[PDB]
Design a protein around this ligand. Structure first.
Ligand SMILES: [Cl-]
Ligand SMILES: [Cl-]
Ligand SMILES: [Cl-]
Ligand SMILES: [Cl-]
Ligand SMILES: [Cl-]
Ligand SMILES: [Cl-]
Ligand SMILES: [Cl-]
Ligand SMILES: [Cl-]
Ligand code: NA
Length: 129
């Protein structure tokens, strides 16, 4: 599923991500935009043989099981395939554990390089929320 901007903002708020660990809704919408262009089925192979899955590009090295990432962990206790669903529950629950890990939203290299410090409120502007 490819979400619209305000549609994803609403689903993220419903699932409790708005202000989670102090990050406003606009930060989470901006991160999804540059990670996946709002497409739940996005995948991207890394140089190290791991893979990033879904609307927030969560990596199989630590967070989910794909059966093909040697020596990896599955800290979210889920198959990576659950991260590609039209229902975002699994992605949001796993993102909560990632953003709690010590480095905040800097865990997402695209949020640090494209969203951090910018006018992130623009991502939720005009949305009926
Ligand atoms: Cl957009
Ligand atoms: Cl915001
Ligand atoms: Cl594996
Ligand atoms: Cl394969
Ligand atoms: Cl594990
Ligand atoms: Cl599994
Ligand atoms: Cl959803
Ligand atoms: Cl923080
Ligand atoms: Na894994």
């Amino acid at each position: 599923k490819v979400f619209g901007r305000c549609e994803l903002a609403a689903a993220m708020k419903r699932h409790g991500l708005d202000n989670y660990r102090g990050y406003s809704l606009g930060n989470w919408v901006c991160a999804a935009k540059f990670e996946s262009n709002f497409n739940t089925q996005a995948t991207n192979r890394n140089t190290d043989g791991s893979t990033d899955y879904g609307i927030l590009q969560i990596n199989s090295r630590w967070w989910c099981n794909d059966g093909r990432t040697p020596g990896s962990r599955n800290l979210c206790n889920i198959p990576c395939s659950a991260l590609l669903s039209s229902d975002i529950t699994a992605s949001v629950n796993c993102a909560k554990k990632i953003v709690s890990d010590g480095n905040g939203m800097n865990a997402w290299v695209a949020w640090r390089n494209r969203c951090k410090g910018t006018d992130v409120q623009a991502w939720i502007r005009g949305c009926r929320l």
